[PDB]
Amino acid sequence: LEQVLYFSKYIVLDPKGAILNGVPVEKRQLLTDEEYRELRYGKQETYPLPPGVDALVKDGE
Amino acid sequence: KGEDVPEPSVPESFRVLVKELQALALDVQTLDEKDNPVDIF
Amino acid sequence: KSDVYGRVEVDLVRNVVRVVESYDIDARMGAEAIQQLLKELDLEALEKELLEEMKHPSRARRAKARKRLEVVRAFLDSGNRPEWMILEAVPVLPPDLRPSDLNDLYRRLINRNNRLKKLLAQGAPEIIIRNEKRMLQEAVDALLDNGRRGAPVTNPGSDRPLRSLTDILSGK
């Protein structure tokens, strides 16, 4: 683990996370930036659609 | 001078060691009677 | 009322309020992330914690704590605390002691440590900041002990590891 963040490539954790990627908050562990950005700062993720195509889901269904 | 050789000062090997040890986290500090500092230099 | 921690989006296109699972949090990186940890680690706490762990658990976990407790002890005991385990100020060996080997490495550090200072006030783009800390963290290891992680070579001429501080202290 050391080598993972000693040079700074990987992430580390602090005071509190109440949410679980799948398991409770990691008091000190580290997670991939994509996942840290996804729930730590939130992750609104888009999905573009081909032109002239209708969807099977509503506004915010 | 036909005199009496002086007394030995800290061998550079001692000196050179303190520093080689300072060069790193390790901090080799020489101490006195009552645990206090002492100067090679 | 909300059920999870998150940002607010008062959408009136659906007459509903979605709270995105995004609350603030804190975390840092690299040598910096351990520097924080080390500073907060309340030896005493873990000392007591290990004390319990040590004499109560089966030999499998108690043994691990035991080896862990000495270090903790040592620090507290002697006094001189562990946060210093982090380099922030590299002490430069005197000029007459070394009339070359170690200098090439010293230059490296100096350079990157400096190219970095400049890369902070000019403009701070992340990918670069990190890529720079890396090299930097690598250099700081060089002058101390080369080989532990790859080996530094004076450009074309001799593929020979530059004698670092450690190499100068050990060996036959």
Side-chain angles (χ1 to χ4, degrees):
Chain A
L1 224 51
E2 223 52 76
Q3 184 124 42
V4 160
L5 55 50
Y6 248 81
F7 311 99
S8 87
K9 172 195 257 161
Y10 295 91
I11 302 270
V12 261
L13 272 192
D14 187 20
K16 79 266 154 159
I19 200 269
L20 355 93
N21 29 310
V23 88
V25 53
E26 280 68 357
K27 315 113 298 172
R28 306 207 262 99
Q29 237 42 72
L30 61 190
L31 39 50
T32 169
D33 166 273
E34 303 313 314
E35 282 45 55
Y36 159 42
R37 295 176 64 186
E38 194 261 327
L39 356 37
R40 264 8 207 179
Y41 267 3
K43 178 264 262 180
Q44 202 285 295
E45 175 188 314
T46 301
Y47 291 63
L49 218 160
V53 184
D54 58 352
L56 289 194
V57 174
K58 338 290 292 178
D59 183 321
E61 165 200 309
Chain B
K1 208 153 127 195
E3 190 205 55
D4 223 347
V5 349
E7 295 307 52
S9 55
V10 170
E12 281 318 274
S13 295
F14 186 112
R15 166 177 312 286
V16 82
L17 220 148
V18 187
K19 274 300 166 262
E20 286 172 304
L21 262 149
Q22 317 253 297
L24 72 107
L26 261 350
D27 158 68
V28 175
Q29 185 61 197
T30 78
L31 284 64
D32 219 35
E33 307 291 49
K34 24 121 223 58
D35 309 310
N36 269 281
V38 166
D39 289 345
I40 13 146
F41 177 80
Chain C
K1 300 186 296 185
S2 173
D3 305 301
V4 188
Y5 289 78
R7 208 263 225 177
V8 187
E9 273 89 308
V10 180
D11 283 293
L12 308 171
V13 188
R14 284 134 289 186
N15 289 289
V16 60
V17 183
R18 42 180 61 71
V19 190
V20 281
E21 196 191 84
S22 56
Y23 215 59
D24 93 63
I25 64 305
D26 298 319
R28 292 220 155 196
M29 23 134 123
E32 208 175 60
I34 326 307
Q35 170 174 45
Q36 273 284 176
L37 284 175
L38 218 184
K39 294 190 176 193
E40 299 170 3
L41 286 193
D42 233 309
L43 325 202
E44 358 255 75
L46 277 58
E47 194 189 16
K48 317 143 91 74
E49 257 163 340
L50 281 188
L51 302 196
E52 310 289 301
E53 185 62 13
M54 193 175 242
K55 237 187 183 309
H56 305 107
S58 321
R59 242 191 302 205
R61 41 196 188 206
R62 92 168 230 212
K64 151 165 264 190
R66 89 88 167 172
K67 183 226 177 184
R68 182 170 162 168
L69 176 41
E70 251 158 77
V71 170
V72 196
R73 183 65 194 185
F75 281 125
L76 297 163
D77 240 31
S78 324
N80 288 32
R81 298 200 163 175
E83 303 80 88
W84 325 152
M85 262 223 254
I86 45 80
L87 273 185
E88 63 141 353
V90 184
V92 190
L93 168 77
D96 288 311
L97 271 71
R98 80 259 194 215
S100 172
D101 0 293
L102 277 70
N103 310 304
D104 280 10
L105 301 163
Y106 257 83
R107 282 198 310 152
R108 294 187 131 307
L109 176 99
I110 292 297
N111 251 180
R112 291 178 207 172
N113 184 55
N114 276 67
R115 200 202 293 138
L116 195 74
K117 292 180 176 187
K118 295 173 185 183
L119 280 172
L120 302 178
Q122 284 192 185
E126 269 284 293
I127 302 176
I128 281 193
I129 293 306
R130 290 173 288 165
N131 268 74
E132 216 70 8
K133 297 298 178 57
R134 294 195 187 196
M135 281 161 62
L136 199 57
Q137 183 68 293
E138 274 188 300
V140 189
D141 273 330
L143 122 160
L144 276 174
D145 188 317
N146 265 350
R148 302 278 146 189
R149 185 190 195 291
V153 291
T154 283
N155 267 67
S158 66
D159 318 282
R160 172 189 59 182
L162 305 85
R163 245 199 175 187
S164 42
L165 285 176
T166 304
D167 279 304
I168 208 65
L169 282 150
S170 93
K172 210 165 180 172

